[PDB]
Short mmCIF file of all heavy atoms in Angstrom, two decimals:
data_model
loop_
_atom_site.label_atom_id
_atom_site.label_comp_id
_atom_site.label_asym_id
_atom_site.label_seq_id
_atom_site.Cartn_x
_atom_site.Cartn_y
_atom_site.Cartn_z
N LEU A 198 -4.51 -30.57 4.58
CA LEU A 198 -3.43 -30.65 5.50
C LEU A 198 -2.78 -29.47 5.77
O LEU A 198 -2.47 -28.73 4.86
CB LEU A 198 -2.43 -31.77 5.14
CG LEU A 198 -2.96 -33.16 4.90
CD1 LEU A 198 -2.04 -34.11 4.10
CD2 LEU A 198 -3.25 -33.88 6.26
N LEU A 199 -2.39 -29.21 7.13
CA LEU A 199 -1.60 -28.21 7.51
C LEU A 199 -0.32 -28.74 8.27
O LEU A 199 -0.47 -29.35 9.37
CB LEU A 199 -2.22 -27.13 8.35
CG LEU A 199 -1.42 -25.82 8.72
CD1 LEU A 199 -0.30 -26.14 9.60
CD2 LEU A 199 -0.95 -24.99 7.46
N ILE A 200 0.90 -28.83 7.62
CA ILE A 200 2.02 -29.30 8.20
C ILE A 200 2.91 -28.22 8.45
O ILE A 200 3.22 -27.30 7.59
CB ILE A 200 2.77 -30.39 7.17
CG1 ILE A 200 1.74 -31.52 6.91
CG2 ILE A 200 3.97 -30.87 7.89
CD1 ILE A 200 1.24 -32.30 8.07
N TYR A 201 3.48 -28.18 9.66
CA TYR A 201 4.34 -26.97 10.03
C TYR A 201 5.77 -27.53 10.23
O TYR A 201 5.96 -28.67 10.59
CB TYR A 201 3.87 -26.23 11.36
CG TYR A 201 3.91 -26.90 12.50
CD1 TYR A 201 5.14 -26.90 13.37
CD2 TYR A 201 2.94 -27.86 13.01
CE1 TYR A 201 5.15 -27.51 14.61
CE2 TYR A 201 3.03 -28.47 14.27
CZ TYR A 201 4.17 -28.34 14.96
OH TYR A 201 4.28 -28.93 16.11
N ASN A 202 6.75 -26.61 9.98
CA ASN A 202 8.12 -26.86 10.29
C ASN A 202 8.53 -26.00 11.51
O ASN A 202 8.71 -24.84 11.37
CB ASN A 202 9.02 -26.58 9.03
CG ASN A 202 10.50 -26.62 9.51
OD1 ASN A 202 10.93 -27.58 10.33
ND2 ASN A 202 11.17 -25.77 8.77
N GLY A 203 8.77 -26.64 12.58
CA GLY A 203 8.65 -27.99 12.92
C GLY A 203 9.28 -28.42 14.23
O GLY A 203 9.47 -27.61 15.08
N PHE A 204 9.45 -29.74 14.50
CA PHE A 204 10.06 -30.25 15.63
C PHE A 204 11.52 -29.78 15.61
O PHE A 204 12.22 -29.87 14.56
CB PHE A 204 9.86 -31.74 15.82
CG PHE A 204 8.58 -32.20 15.96
CD1 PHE A 204 8.31 -33.63 15.73
CD2 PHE A 204 7.56 -31.41 16.31
CE1 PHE A 204 7.02 -34.04 15.80
CE2 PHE A 204 6.29 -31.96 16.48
CZ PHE A 204 5.93 -33.30 16.30
N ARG A 205 12.10 -29.31 16.72
CA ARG A 205 13.50 -28.83 16.82
C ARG A 205 13.96 -29.09 18.21
O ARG A 205 13.63 -28.34 19.10
CB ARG A 205 13.58 -27.38 16.42
N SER A 206 14.78 -30.21 18.42
CA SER A 206 15.35 -30.59 19.62
C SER A 206 16.31 -29.54 20.19
O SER A 206 16.27 -28.93 21.26
CB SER A 206 15.96 -31.94 19.68
OG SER A 206 17.25 -31.85 18.88
N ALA A 216 13.35 -24.06 17.05
CA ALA A 216 13.33 -23.91 18.52
C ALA A 216 11.82 -24.09 18.81
O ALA A 216 11.22 -23.34 19.56
CB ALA A 216 13.76 -22.71 19.08
N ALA A 217 11.20 -25.30 18.40
CA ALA A 217 9.80 -25.49 18.55
C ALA A 217 9.54 -26.97 18.76
O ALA A 217 10.44 -27.84 18.58
CB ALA A 217 9.00 -25.10 17.18
N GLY A 218 8.32 -27.39 19.05
CA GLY A 218 8.02 -28.76 19.43
C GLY A 218 6.61 -28.96 19.13
O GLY A 218 6.04 -28.52 18.12
N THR A 219 5.98 -29.89 19.92
CA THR A 219 4.59 -30.44 19.63
C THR A 219 3.49 -29.35 19.91
O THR A 219 2.27 -29.60 19.63
CB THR A 219 4.30 -31.68 20.42
OG1 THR A 219 4.56 -31.41 21.67
CG2 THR A 219 5.13 -32.77 19.90
N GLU A 220 3.87 -28.17 20.62
CA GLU A 220 2.84 -27.23 21.01
C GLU A 220 1.89 -26.81 19.91
O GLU A 220 0.80 -26.39 20.40
CB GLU A 220 3.52 -26.11 21.65
CG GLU A 220 4.33 -25.22 20.93
CD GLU A 220 5.87 -25.60 20.84
OE1 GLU A 220 6.13 -26.78 21.23
OE2 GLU A 220 6.68 -24.70 20.42
N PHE A 221 2.23 -26.83 18.66
CA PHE A 221 1.36 -26.39 17.61
C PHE A 221 0.56 -27.52 17.03
O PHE A 221 -0.38 -27.27 16.23
CB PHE A 221 2.24 -25.78 16.56
CG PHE A 221 2.99 -24.51 16.88
CD1 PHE A 221 4.38 -24.55 17.09
CD2 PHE A 221 2.33 -23.26 17.22
CE1 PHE A 221 5.00 -23.48 17.46
CE2 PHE A 221 2.98 -22.34 17.52
CZ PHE A 221 4.29 -22.21 17.82
N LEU A 222 0.84 -28.78 17.47
CA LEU A 222 0.02 -29.81 16.88
C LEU A 222 -1.48 -29.75 17.08
O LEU A 222 -2.12 -30.26 16.16
CB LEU A 222 0.53 -31.16 17.44
CG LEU A 222 1.92 -31.69 16.87
CD1 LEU A 222 2.30 -32.85 17.74
CD2 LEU A 222 1.88 -31.98 15.35
N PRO A 223 -1.99 -29.17 18.09
CA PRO A 223 -3.47 -29.17 18.33
C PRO A 223 -4.09 -28.34 17.26
O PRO A 223 -5.38 -28.46 17.14
CB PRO A 223 -3.81 -28.42 19.69
CG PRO A 223 -2.46 -28.91 20.47
CD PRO A 223 -1.35 -28.83 19.41
N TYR A 224 -3.45 -27.45 16.40
CA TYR A 224 -3.93 -26.59 15.50
C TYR A 224 -3.59 -26.94 14.04
O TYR A 224 -3.84 -26.22 13.12
CB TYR A 224 -3.50 -25.14 15.86
CG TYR A 224 -3.60 -24.89 17.35
CD1 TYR A 224 -2.60 -24.95 18.16
CD2 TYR A 224 -4.92 -24.37 17.88
CE1 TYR A 224 -2.74 -24.65 19.54
CE2 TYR A 224 -4.97 -24.14 19.11
CZ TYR A 224 -4.04 -24.22 19.99
OH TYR A 224 -4.19 -23.92 21.37
N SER A 225 -2.95 -28.07 13.90
CA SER A 225 -2.37 -28.56 12.70
C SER A 225 -2.65 -29.98 12.48
O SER A 225 -3.11 -30.65 13.31
CB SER A 225 -0.88 -28.10 12.60
OG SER A 225 -0.09 -28.86 13.64
N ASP A 226 -2.00 -30.49 11.33
CA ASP A 226 -2.16 -32.01 10.98
C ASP A 226 -0.84 -32.71 11.24
O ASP A 226 -1.04 -34.02 11.23
CB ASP A 226 -2.80 -32.17 9.61
CG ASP A 226 -4.09 -31.58 9.47
OD1 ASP A 226 -5.08 -31.99 10.13
OD2 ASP A 226 -4.21 -30.44 8.74
N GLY A 227 0.23 -32.00 11.37
CA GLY A 227 1.46 -32.79 11.48
C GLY A 227 2.70 -31.73 11.47
O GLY A 227 2.48 -30.47 11.37
N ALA A 228 3.88 -32.31 11.57
CA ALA A 228 5.09 -31.50 11.58
C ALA A 228 6.18 -32.18 10.92
O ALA A 228 6.16 -33.32 10.66
CB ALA A 228 5.40 -31.21 13.12
N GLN A 229 7.23 -31.40 10.61
CA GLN A 229 8.43 -31.77 9.99
C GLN A 229 9.59 -31.83 10.94
O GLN A 229 9.62 -30.98 11.86
CB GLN A 229 8.91 -30.98 8.77
CG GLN A 229 10.13 -31.53 8.18
CD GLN A 229 10.48 -30.62 6.90
OE1 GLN A 229 10.82 -29.49 7.09
NE2 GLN A 229 10.52 -31.33 5.69
N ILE A 230 10.39 -32.94 10.94
CA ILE A 230 11.69 -32.92 11.61
C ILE A 230 12.78 -32.63 10.51
O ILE A 230 13.17 -33.49 9.82
CB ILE A 230 12.03 -34.20 12.37
CG1 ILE A 230 10.97 -34.63 13.26
CG2 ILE A 230 13.37 -34.17 12.94
CD1 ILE A 230 11.01 -36.03 13.68
N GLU A 231 13.09 -31.37 10.39
CA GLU A 231 14.09 -31.03 9.25
C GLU A 231 15.52 -31.33 9.60
O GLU A 231 16.19 -31.75 8.68
CB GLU A 231 13.96 -29.40 9.07
CG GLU A 231 14.82 -29.05 7.92
CD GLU A 231 14.85 -27.53 7.78
OE1 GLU A 231 14.43 -26.84 8.64
OE2 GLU A 231 15.38 -27.07 6.75
N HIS A 232 15.92 -31.38 10.78
CA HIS A 232 17.28 -31.63 11.26
C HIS A 232 17.41 -33.05 11.76
O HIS A 232 17.91 -33.11 12.98
CB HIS A 232 17.94 -30.64 12.05
CG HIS A 232 17.99 -29.22 11.55
ND1 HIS A 232 18.45 -28.09 12.25
CD2 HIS A 232 17.58 -28.72 10.34
CE1 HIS A 232 18.40 -27.04 11.35
NE2 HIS A 232 17.89 -27.51 10.16
N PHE A 233 16.81 -34.03 11.19
CA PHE A 233 16.85 -35.37 11.74
C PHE A 233 18.43 -35.83 11.58
O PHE A 233 18.82 -36.26 10.45
CB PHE A 233 15.93 -36.23 10.99
CG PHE A 233 15.69 -37.62 11.50
CD1 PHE A 233 15.23 -37.73 12.77
CD2 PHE A 233 16.11 -38.79 10.76
CE1 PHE A 233 15.01 -39.16 13.31
CE2 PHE A 233 15.95 -40.03 11.33
CZ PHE A 233 15.41 -40.16 12.48
#
Side-chain angles (χ1 to χ4, degrees), residues 198-204 206 216-233:
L198 297 166
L199 188 291
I200 302 301
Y201 70 92
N202 172 41
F204 299 161
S206 73
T219 54
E220 63 266 17
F221 297 108
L222 286 171
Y224 312 98
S225 66
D226 299 294
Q229 179 175 67
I230 303 168
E231 181 183 18
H232 297 178
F233 191 62

